[PDB]
């Protein structure tokens, strides 16, 4: 069972927030999910991860424990691209991709 990444398409304007929802909760509950931006030539570019890998892309967990809000604060026009949320079981599972548009 892989993670989810909704909505499939997210059209926001230039300046406001943009938030996706990565729904994932495995059979072990010992997981660390990443938030990568896929390049036009299939070369992921990690943005953030939960728990916050300390070393504008927010990652907050909801009370249900299965949904995670991945937010792009003050979405710039260059942020339009492909995004996905991976999941690592302590093994990796990539969620379905999704598009992000910024008018």
């Amino acid at each position: 069972n892989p993670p989810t990444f909704s909505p499939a398409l997210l059209v926001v304007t230039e300046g406001d927030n943009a938030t996706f929802t990565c729904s994932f909760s495995n059979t072990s509950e010992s997981f660390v999910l990443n938030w990568y931006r896929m390049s036009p030539s299939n070369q992921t570019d990690k943005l953030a991860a939960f728990p916050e890998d300390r070393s504008r892309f927010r990652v907050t967990q909801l009370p249900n424990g299965r949904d995670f809000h991945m937010s792009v604060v003050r979405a710039r026009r260059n942020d339009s691209g492909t995004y996905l949320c991976g999941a690592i079981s302590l093994q990796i599972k990539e969620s379905l991709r999704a598009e992000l548009r910024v008018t």
Epitope: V32, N34, Y36, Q43, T44, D45, K46, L47, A48, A49, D53, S55, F57, G86, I88, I92
Partner: antibody
């Protein structure tokens, strides 16, 4: 394409300062970090330092006070200076691009062997 | 300075067989670890980024794993063009140290 072309002198006299350069082509030099790496004869890879898009650098504690990494944005070049050179600096220096918000070294340079000798 | 220690200094599995390489860090470099392949004379080549995702144009036979201080690089079926040195690299904190390389050679 995405490249990194290194160029420097073949020889370096002991106690002098070694000057290197990494001419870039393909990507916005003000949007990617360039990392210098050393490869001594018959040995592995050793990190020398980085230069981010803002213009700040991080150096190897063992190499600090001798390394200097700058960049000429109007020329798409990254410079590497090594003062008070000894016979230990003889190696193959590599410049490499850094990709991602949580960076990783993707593209590498061609390499430039430096022989510290008289 | 985090110490990247590759365990199999020299690996010589046969042709077409599985071949894994371990690279353990002395501290938590949790998922900013990249793998590189280098041949004599040529510069390094990247294979795995973030320790799981494989780079573009990289054969499918390559796989990566690890999240703490336990990283691995796996080759499903070893090919003749795979003979090279494989270096791991940490990007967690300075001095972003590397491993020491694992020489991968073919037995025939």
């Amino acid at each position: 394409q995405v490249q990194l072309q290194e160029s420097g002198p073949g020889l370096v006299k002991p106690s002098e300062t070694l000057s290197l350069t990494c001419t870039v082509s393909g990507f916005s030099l003000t949007s990617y970090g360039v990392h210098w790496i050393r490869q001594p004869p018959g040995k592995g890879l050793e990190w020398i330092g980085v230069i981010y898009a803002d213009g700040s650098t991080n150096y190897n504690p063992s190499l600090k006070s001798r390394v200097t990494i700058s960049k000429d944005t109007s020329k798409n070049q990254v410079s590497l200076k090594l003062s008070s050179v000894t016979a230990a600096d003889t190696a193959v220096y590599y410049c490499a691009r850094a990709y991602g918000n949580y960076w990783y070294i993707d593209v590498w340079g061609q390499g430039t062997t430096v022989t510290v000798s008289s | 300075d985090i110490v990247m220690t590759q365990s199999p200094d020299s690996l010589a599995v046969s042709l077409g067989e599985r071949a894994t390489i371990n690279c353990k860090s002395s501290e938590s470099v949790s998922n900013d670890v990249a793998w590189y392949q280098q041949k004599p004379g040529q510069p390094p080549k990247l294979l795995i980024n973030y320790a799981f995702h494989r780079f573009t144009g990289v054969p499918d036979r390559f796989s990566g794993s690890g999240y703490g201080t336990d990283f691995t690089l796996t080759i499903s079926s070893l090919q003749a063009e795979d003979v090279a040195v494989y270096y791991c690299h940490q990007a967690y904190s300075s001095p972003y140290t590397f491993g020491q390389g694992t020489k991968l050679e073919i037995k025939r």
